[PDB]
From a paper:
Pacritinib and fedratinib possessed the highest JAK2 selectivity in the binding assay. Pacritinib makes two hydrogen bonds to the hinge, to the main chain carbonyl and amide of Leu932, and a hydrogen bond with Leu855 from the β1-strand. The binding of pacritinib is also stabilized by water-mediated hydrogen bonds to Ser936 and Asp939. Pacritinib stabilizes a collapsed G-loop structure in JAK2, where Phe860 is buried within the binding site. Pacritinib and gandotinib represent the first JAK2 structures with a collapsed G-loop conformation. Interestingly, the collapsed G-loop conformation in pacritinib and gandotinib leads to ATP-pocket, which is fully closed in the direction of the G-loop. Interestingly, the binding of pacritinib and gandotinib, which both form a collapsed G-loop, is driven both by enthalpy and entropy. The favorable entropy is partly due to the desolvation of Phe860 at the tip of the G-loop, which buries itself to the ATP-pocket upon inhibitor binding. Gandotinib, pacritinib, and lestaurtinib, which make a water-mediated hydrogen bond to Asp939, could directly interact with the glutamate in this position in JAK1. Taken together, the collapsed G-loop conformation could have a selectivity benefit toward JAK2 due to a more rigid G-loop structure in JAK1 and TYK2, as demonstrated by pacritinib, which displays the highest selectivity over JAK1 of the tested inhibitors.
MPNs are clonal neoplastic diseases initiated in the bone marrow from a mutated hematopoietic stem cell. All of these compounds are type-I inhibitors that target the conserved active conformation of the adenosine 5′-triphosphate (ATP)-binding pocket of the kinase domain and show variable target selectivity and differences in clinical profiles. Structural analysis showed that all compounds anchor to the ATP-pocket of the kinase domain of JAK2 by making two or three hydrogen bonds with the hinge region.
Numbering used by the authors: 833 to 1132
The structure:
Amino acid sequence: NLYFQSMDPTQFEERHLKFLQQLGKGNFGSVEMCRYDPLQDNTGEVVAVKKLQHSTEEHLRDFEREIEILKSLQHDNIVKYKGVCYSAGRRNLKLIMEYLPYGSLRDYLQKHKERIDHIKLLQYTSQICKGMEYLGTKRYIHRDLATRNILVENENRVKIGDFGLTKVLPQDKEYYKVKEPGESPIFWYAPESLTESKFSVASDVWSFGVVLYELFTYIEKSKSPPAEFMRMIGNDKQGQMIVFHLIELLKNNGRLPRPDGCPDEIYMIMTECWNNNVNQRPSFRDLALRVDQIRDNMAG
Ligand SMILES: C1=C/COCc2cc(ccc2OCCN2CCCC2)Nc2nccc(n2)-c2cccc(c2)COC/1
């Protein structure tokens, strides 16, 4: 009550945060490119700024928790927290991050196939696994691992980018049971997430298997996880019927296909991630090591 939580409201002052570009709007809210130019000389660092789309009390509270999560993370493969801007005369909240120029990995794979080969895909895979190892040391569950939430700094570096659904494990449990679900990315969910709302490191590993599938489909039209699962369940189905059939499909070993051109050994990693037995899924540490050994065993 007495001494309010530490925060630096002078680090990013709204009057010096200059708009450069709207980058995207979505479930995550809205993200812009800005320049922070305190010496009003048309210079300063370029930053990414996350804002809410609908500024309800619940969303602001969720946003505060998301900011605290990101601030607590420092890793080469996690987007870098810089600070907060308390704009509207310190009656609003905006998240300030480093700016990563190539956007989401989902878009990058579609827009920049000219500079992507299997070596790069394996490098991105490795980096995502290492980011996720680090999250696990904090007992954070990402819950939304998907190429749309991974950001691209350059041809050699990706970072896990959005933490809007991330949960902190209870002290005594290895899973978080989400008891207020919003919009759910069901085609990335593990079966126990679909059927019991249970999220864990192992359910992030399931989602990572889907990420790995995404990478090797090169975000080809008709090959996205939603498109493939809908083709398998029946494109005609609507509403809850989709979820019912997805669960039944996954519970009896229905899986996304091997992407065209995907090596069998990479598909084997996917299918090991997609184990209905939670305890039998590999760890992110297992996965980083295996992928880097595959990379390292190539000639050169
Ligand atoms: C990305 C979603 C769409 O790409 C936006 C996008 C994003 C970036 C660069 C280009 C770009 O779209 C360049 C192409 N845009 C498409 C429409 C106009 C520009 N860079 C960036 N850098 C740091 C943090 C975030 N985004 C960030 C942090 C939290 C949440 C998000 C981003 C939103 O989810 C991840």
